[PDB]
Each structure stands twice: as structure tokens, then as C-alpha cells.
Amino acid sequence: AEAGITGTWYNQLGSTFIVTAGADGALTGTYESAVGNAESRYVLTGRYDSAPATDGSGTALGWTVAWKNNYRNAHSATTWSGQYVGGAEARINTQWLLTSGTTEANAWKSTLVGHDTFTKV
Amino acid sequence: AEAGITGTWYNQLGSTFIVTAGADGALTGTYESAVGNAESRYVLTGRYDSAPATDGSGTALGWTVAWKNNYRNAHSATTWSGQYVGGAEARINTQWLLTSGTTEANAWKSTLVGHDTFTKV
Amino acid sequence: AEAGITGTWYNQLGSTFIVTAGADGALTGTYESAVGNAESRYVLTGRYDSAPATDGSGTALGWTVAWKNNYRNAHSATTWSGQYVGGAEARINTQWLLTSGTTEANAWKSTLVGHDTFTKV
Amino acid sequence: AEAGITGTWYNQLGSTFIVTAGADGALTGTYESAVGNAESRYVLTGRYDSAPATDGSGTALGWTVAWKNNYRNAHSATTWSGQYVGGAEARINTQWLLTSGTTEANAWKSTLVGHDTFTKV
């Protein structure tokens, strides 16, 4: 985990994120998207639970990206929750929630759910 | 948002979290739980999209908590995605994803989904 | 369960559904909504697992509503997954997924997630 | 849709389901699983919204399976929400929610979320 998490990851839709896993569970980095009301790089921050593992389990982690930078303000944020699996073909399998700021009447339709798999290749 | 987000929040199951919303979209603080394989305070980190709003919309945000501290290591992490609504009865309405580290065979049953509403009272 | 499930249920946003729980796990009825690109009554069909319970557990169930009737065709469908709890204040607590038909490019943003609590009152 | 939906579908984990899409939005069939506290065939019932489409969109649908049959009673039910895409490589992309009957104290951890892609091959 940690060392193995640090680096560049890519998902099936063309997004990329670079992250550094800190010794004490922190995850800091940048996310550059391919889809959405996104344009360029956004700051990401998260945590991972290591001290993950004598039975080859994945390392649980999660991170958040607020979709605001100097070129775009999408009034939304996405959180990814999943686990890191290392080795030959290391990957981070996740499920995500994207919430957009709405008025109280439309709050019932403010959150989208999806999944993403990231690889080092 | 920000100023209004900073402070202590409580949810329906008895959990509490104290957070500081930084000028540039950061959210840092601690989460003390009431349920789970949790015991005491855990570090939380997240982001919010302000620059939220001429039509009274909520401010989108998200945060992560890795369930590891000096007393417990639950090998899991939770991410909350939702929005902040301020005023008299300010609240943060969220949906969350809790992923536990599993072996590849049980990865299909590694993530729980739920919702939480936090208030200042 | 079953007998206790049969009847009219109402949720916090003003929607109502009438359902009949059949002896062999079937759920059939109609849903009349309050929100969305919905207008009038829609057919609902689902299943419940009874034979639910010596430790006062809820009865798991789920149902689907395709949002098409003689007055509206929203090109979407919602599924609710949750459990029935009977007694004085019987309720059905659920989480739902609403998927809209999209082109392949927008499939990543086709599903909304939410929760609903239904009561007999 | 409908005609194209009728038939046998398989997912990445080895489960199979046979379904008949009825002229008026009904979906009826059987699901045979590969994973879980499942064993053999279970009844499935659902709905689809056709009258789906001059811009090649998918057809929204959803179905439910209560995990009880003559050999197993798992006290749980799963609902799948997604869309059907036809053609050469027709597929049904879905997100699912699996709720297990729990006591009120553990209701917060009663629902799992995941995704499944089904193909005709």
C-alpha cells in the first residue's frame, strides 16, 4: 500500500490522478478529468487505512475532489471509496458519489453514483 | 458556506465531527463515531466547492475518514458526499460509501451505502 | 410481513404506493408520485423475502417502477431496495437507484441514488 | 428493446438470468447466481421503459430478486437498476443494491452497493 499507491493512475474514461500516500494515512494529489463540467486539474485529498494483511486483501481508501479551480466552478464534488490491490496488475477499484449543490426542492436528484477502476497503465 | 461549515456537527446516530473549512476549499477535522468498528477520534479530510449562489442552493462537499487510529484499525474507510445548507437550521445532508479491504473473491460485497444528516444541535 | 406489507404507504415527499404482498414473495401494486417527470400512477412489481425472524429483524424487499404510463414517458426507471419493519410504527426504509436511458457517452451520469422512508400514516 | 431484451444474459461473476420482456413493460424470469448465500434459481420480476429513441440511448429498466427458494432463504433481496443497449454487442449495464433484513441497531449496515454488466455471450 502507501508506496504502491503513490504515483499516477488512469481510469477507463481517460481521467488521470497523481497521488502521494503519506506515512500517516494521508492521500494528497491532483485529479485531471476527461468528462464532466471539469477542465484541467483539481486538488484531491483523502485517507487510506494501512496498516492494511496476511490474506492478500485490498487496502481501503477514499478521496474527494471539489470541482472548482481557476478555470471552472461546477458547484459539485465527487468522493471515491474503494480499495487498492497491488502487484503485477495493481488497481484501485472504486464506487463514487457526485453531489451537485441544489435548491431544497431538487435535493432528491442531487447525487449520482458510479464506479471507476484505475490502473497504472 | 466555509464560515458556516466550520464547527461541530452531530448526526442522528450519535456521531460528532468538528471541521474547519479553509479559505481554499479544504476541510480538515476529526470524526468521533457512535457506531461501527470505530472507537474514539479519527482524522477527516475533504473539500468543499464554494464559491457555491443567488438561488439559495446548498454548497457541495465531501470528506473521507480511514478507520484507523491508536486504538482501532478497522481496515476500512468511509466517504460522505453531500451539501451544506446554512441558516436557522443549517444542515449537511449526505450519502456515504463505506468500503472494507477484502480479498478479490469478496470484493463484490465490500461496499455499504447509507445516508446521514448532520445538524449543529 | 406480507399481511403487514399489504396496504397504502406514504413517503416524506408526498408519494404514495399501494401494494399487495402475495403468499409466494410477490409484490404488485401502483405508485403515484409527487416529484419527478412523473404524473399519475405507474405499475410497480417486486419481491420480498419472508419467510423473514426470532430476533425482530426487518423483512428485505425491493420493487421497480418504469416511469411510463398513458400520460408520461420519462425514459427512466427507479428500483427501491430496503426492509419492512412492522408494529405500532411500521415502516419501510429504502435506498433507491433511478437510471435514465442515455447515449453511451453520458452513461456515467445516468444513475441517481437516494433514500426514502415510507409509513402507513 | 423488449425483443432484444428477451433471452439469456450472463455477467462477469458467472451468474445467469433468463428474462421475457412483455409488451407492456413487464420483465419476468429467473436468476441463477454464482456468488452469495444463493443456490440455484430465484424468481425475478421487473419493468422496463420502452417506449425507449432517435439518438441511440439505452432503454431504462430494473428488476428485483428476493433470495429465497426451496433450498435457501438468505433473508435478503437485490434490485438492479440500469439500461439495455442492443446491437452487435448488446449489454445491460447496471448498479445494484442488496439489502439484508437486520435488527434496527444494524440497519445502517444493511445495504451493499455494486455494479454488474451483462452480455448475451
Grid cell in block for residue D26: 413487464
The Cα–Cα gap between C15 and C21 comes to 19
* Chain A nearest C-alpha distance from C51 (Å): 32
Across the interface, which of A35, A36, A113 has its CB nearest the CB of C113? Answer: A113
Question: What is the least distance, in Å, from the CA of A77 to any CA of chain C?
Answer: 14
B9-29 in b/e form (b: 16+ CB < 10 A) is bebeeebebebebeeebbbeb
Looking at CA atoms only, how far is residue D103 from chain A in angstroms? 26
Residue in B81, B113, B116 to test binding to C, most C beta-carbons within 10 Å: B113
Task: Report the distance separating Cα B28 and Cα B19, nearest Å.
Answer: 6
* Interchain CB contact of B30 with A (< 8 Å): no
Buried/exposed C62-71: b ≥16 CB within 10 Å, e otherwise = bbbbbbbbee
Lookup: cell for B38 = 470505530
Are A52 and A60 in contact, with CB atoms under 8 Å apart?
A: yes
Residues in chain C: 121
Report the SS3 class of residue C109. Answer: helix
CA distances from residue B37 to A17, A25, B19, B67, C105 in whole angstroms, order as listed = 30, 18, 22, 8, 40
B81 touches chain C (CB under 8 A): no
- Which 3 state secondary structure label does DSSP give C3? helix
Q: Is C77 helix (H, G, I), strand (E, B) or coil?
A: strand
C23: burial class by Cβ within 10 Å (0-12, 13-18, 19+)? Answer: exposed
CA distance A111 to chain B (A): 8
B97, B98, B108 member nearest D13 (Cβ):
B108
Map out the domains of chain C with their CATH numbers: 1-121 (2.40.128.30)
**Residue in A closest to B43 by C-alpha:** A47
> Which of B48, B53, B100 shows the shortest C-beta gap to A60?
B100
Q: Could you give the count of Cα atoms lying within 13 Å of B14 in the half-sphere of its Cβ?
A: 9
Reported resolution in A?
1.4
Residue-wise DSSP of B29-61:
EEEE-SSSS--SEEEEEEEE-----TT-PPEEE
Phi, psi of B108, rounded to the nearest 5 degrees: -65, -20
What distance in Å separates the CA atoms of residue D110 and residue D31, rounded to the nearest whole number? Answer: 22
The technique by which this structure was obtained is X-ray
User: CA separation (Å) from D115 to A99, A117, B119, D50, D118?
Assistant: 19, 12, 32, 22, 10
Q: Is B96 annotated as a binding residue?
A: yes
CA dist C101 and A63 (Å) reads: 29
Q: Cα dist. C53→C8, C47, C59, C90, D95 in Å?
A: 24, 18, 9, 16, 29
Q: Are B33 and B42 in contact (CB under 8 A)?
A: yes
Q: Which residues of B touch C114 (CB under 8 A)?
A: 95
Whole-angstrom distance, CA of residue B85 vs CA of residue B1: 8
Strand partners, A34: none
For D114, half-sphere exposure in the C-beta direction (CA atoms, 13 angstrom radius) is 17
> Which of A13, A95, A98, A111 to mutate to test binding with chain D, by most D CBs within 10 Å of its CB?
A95
Q: Any chain A CB within 8 A of the CB of D111?
A: no
Sign of CA dihedral C68, C105, A46, A83: positive
With beta carbons under 8 A apart, name residues in chain C contacting B113.
95, 113
User: Can you give the three-state secondary structure of B67-95, one letter per residue?
Assistant: EECCCCEEEEEEEEEEEEECCCCCEEEEE
| Helices (H), ranges, chain A | none
C-alpha closest to that of C62 among D77, A28, D39 = D77
Contact assignment for C113 to B114 by CB distance below 8 Å: no
